[PDB]
């Protein structure tokens, strides 16, 4: 409706799960995050809006089972919210003043609060201060990450499969630095694996050595609890996004995928259902990709000119393609319904996807 655009919801986001649309009065989204069954929107006026499932208190809005409509977390209004990350049952938020907050499930210490007690309102992670300028947050299944502007990566929560790169420790309930001796520029926590990109463009992956999603050859899979270089991508890596059983990697002129693709989430065609080796998506070679996003079982790409391509599991309409079109897509497919829009932001969750797009005029 407004020229600045709208947030579009697809799938089971709880906003009656039909393709939905909302916007804010004199405010605009600047950041989107989707967890397994919930969503977060950070606005330009530095407010946080939460919606979806709240069974574990992941919305930070009290004890209600679910909240259908995007709801302002007014408890954080004294602070300038800049970023948010949604995991399976928890949410992380960072503020301009140097405070990082968490709410939701805490069974593996993913809130980073020093215990394993669940919370249903946002609590300060006292480990983080104004000394830590947060560039990025990420959150997986009972896992958490915060990346600073000067390239320090901190992770906490579950490490039972090595998914926070802390070797033989089972889990941690306090943020701990994860490093291989280089500044980090990008981090993504998938469900049971994670990855980071160094400032020199190297990709490191760690976590569950299953389904080929680490993208490492067999001789390296034993050391999956330590971050290891994906040497089979020779080009400089810019972004990584980790999903349920797949991984998506952005380089300057190519998108790589690896792991499981039984729903089409690898985008490598109708014949390739899994790969342990990183493979380039060939159908979109002609276009430059500016952003990548992973849900549990689907993938979204935004191009430099603001087109969006999706692929993978079509259930609930989460690919954002068509009202009746619920089939799986094995190649990146143009979101033709956004053709007269610039797609600006996208986040993908378990059974839903959230999109920020503004119309061409």
Nearest alpha-carbon partner for 44 in 11, 7, 86, 87: 7
Instruction: Give the integer Cα–Cα distance in Å for 87 and 93.
Output: 12
Instruction: Give the integer Cα–Cα distance in Å for 138 and 192.
Output: 13
Residue 54 to residues 66, 69, 85, 155, 234: CA-CA distances in angstroms? 5, 12, 15, 24, 42
Instruction: Give the integer Cα–Cα distance in Å for 304 and 322.
Output: 23
Instruction: Give the integer Cα–Cα distance in Å for 8 and 135.
Output: 25
Containing H/E element for 184? Answer: strand 184-189
Cβ atoms of residues 6 and 15 within 8 Å: no
Which structure tokens are listed for 338?
Answer: 């956004």
Name the CATH code of domain 1-361 (choices 2.130.10.30, 3.40.190.10, 3.10.180.10, 3.40.50.720): 2.130.10.30
Instruction: Give the integer Cα–Cα distance in Å for 344 and 359.
Output: 11
Cβ atoms of residues 295 and 318 within 8 Å: yes
3-class DSSP assignment, residue 223 = helix
Which structure tokens are listed for 75?
Answer: 């408890």
Please state, as a whole number, how many other Cβ atoms lie within 10 Å of the Cβ of residue 262.
16
Instruction: Give the integer Cα–Cα distance in Å for 304 and 1.
Output: 24
CA dihedral 21, 27, 29, 35 (to 10 degrees): -70
Contacts of the segment 41-44: beta carbons below 8 A, 24+ positions apart: 41/7, 41/70, 41/84, 41/354, 42/81, 42/82, 42/83, 42/84
- Phi-psi group of 166: left, alpha or beta (phi > 0 → left; psi -120 to 50 → alpha; rest → beta): alpha
Which structure tokens are listed for 218?
Answer: 């067999």
Q: Which strands form 38-43's sheet, in the order they lie side by side? A: 29-34, 38-43, 48-53, 66-72
User: In which residue are the tokens 């089939």 written?
Assistant: 327
3-class DSSP assignment, residue 113 = coil
The experimental resolution of this structure, in angstroms, equals: 1.7
According to DSSP, the residues that pair with 154 across neighbouring strands are 146, 177
- DSSP labels, 179-248: -SSS-EEEEEE-SSEEEEEETTS-EEEEE---TTTT---GGGGGGTTS-EE-TT--SPEEEEEE-SSEEE
Nearest alpha-carbon partner for 64 in 11, 17, 121: 121
Instruction: Give the integer Cα–Cα distance in Å for 359 and 213.
Output: 36
φ, ψ (nearest 5 deg) of residue 204:
-120, 130
The pairing of strands 193-198 and 308-312 is unpaired
Residues 6+ apart with CB under 8 A from 94: 81, 82, 83, 84, 100, 101, 128, 134, 137, 146
Residue 300 to residues 88, 185, 303, 335: CA-CA distances in angstroms? 19, 21, 10, 10
Domain residue limits, the chain: 1-361
Instruction: Give the integer Cα–Cα distance in Å for 161 and 170.
Output: 8
3-class DSSP assignment, residue 74 = helix
3-class DSSP assignment, residue 250 = strand
- DSSP labels, 122-183: EEE-TT--TTS-EEEEEE-SSEEEEEETTS-EEEEEE-TTSTTS-TT--EEEEEEE--SSS-
Residue 257 to residues 243, 280, 292: CA-CA distances in angstroms? 11, 7, 11
Instruction: Give the integer Cα–Cα distance in Å for 342 and 32.
Output: 16
Instruction: Give the integer Cα–Cα distance in Å for 138 and 144.
Output: 6
Cβ atoms of residues 350 and 295 within 8 Å: yes
Cβ atoms of residues 166 and 132 within 8 Å: no
In angstroms, what is the C-alpha Rg of the chain? 19
Cβ atoms of residues 193 and 145 within 8 Å: no
Instruction: Give the integer Cα–Cα distance in Å for 330 and 350.
Output: 18
φ, ψ (nearest 5 deg) of residue 112:
65, 30
Instruction: Give the integer Cα–Cα distance in Å for 154 and 109.
Output: 14
């Amino acid at each position: 409706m407004p020229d600045s655009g709208a947030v579009f919801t697809f799938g089971k986001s709880k906003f009656e799960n039909n393709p939905g649309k909302f916007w804010f009065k004199n405010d605009v989204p600047v950041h989107l995050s989707c967890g397994d069954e919930h969503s977060a929107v950070v606005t330009g006026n530095n407010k946080l809006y939460m919606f979806g499932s709240n069974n574990w208190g992941q919305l930070g809005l009290g004890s209600k089972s679910a909240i259908s409509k995007p709801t302002c977390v007014k408890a954080l209004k004294p602070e300038k919210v800049k970023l948010a990350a949604c995991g399976r049952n928890h949410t992380l938020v960072s503020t301009e003043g140097g405070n990082v907050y968490a709410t939701g499930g805490n069974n593996e210490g993913q809130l980073g609060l020093g215990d394993t007690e669940e919370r249903n309102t946002f609590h300060v992670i006292s480990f983080f201060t104004s000394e830590h300028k947060i560039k990025q947050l990420s959150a997986g299944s009972n896992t958490s990450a915060a990346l600073t502007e000067d390239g320090r990566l901190f992770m906490w929560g579950d490490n039972s499969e090595g998914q926070i790169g802390l070797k033989n420790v089972s889990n941690v309930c306090v943020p701990q630095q994860v490093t291989i001796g280089k500044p980090v520029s990008w981090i993504s926590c998938g469900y049971y694996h994670s990855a980071f990109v160094t400032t020199d463009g190297e990709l490191y992956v760690f976590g569950e050595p299953e389904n080929g999603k680490l993208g490492l050859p067999n001789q390296l899979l034993g050391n999956h609890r330590t971050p290891q270089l994906v040497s089979e991508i020779p080009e400089k890596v810019i972004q990584v996004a980790c999903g349920g059983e797949h991984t998506v990697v952005l380089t300057e002129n190519a998108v790589y995928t690896f792991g499981l693709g039984q729903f089409g989430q690898l985008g490598l065609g109708t014949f390739l259902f899994e790969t342990s080796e990183p493979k380039v998506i060939e159908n979109i070679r002609d276009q430059t990709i500016s952003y990548i996003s992973c849900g549990e079982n689907h993938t979204a790409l935004i191009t430099d000119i603001g087109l969006m391509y999706t692929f993978g599991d079509g259930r609930h309409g989460k690919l954002g393609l068509g009202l009746e079109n619920f089939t799986n897509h094995f190649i990146p497919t143009l979101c033709s319904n956004f053709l007269r829009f610039i797609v600006k932001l996208v986040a993908c969750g378990g059974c839903h996807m959230v999109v920020f797009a503004a119309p061409h005029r």
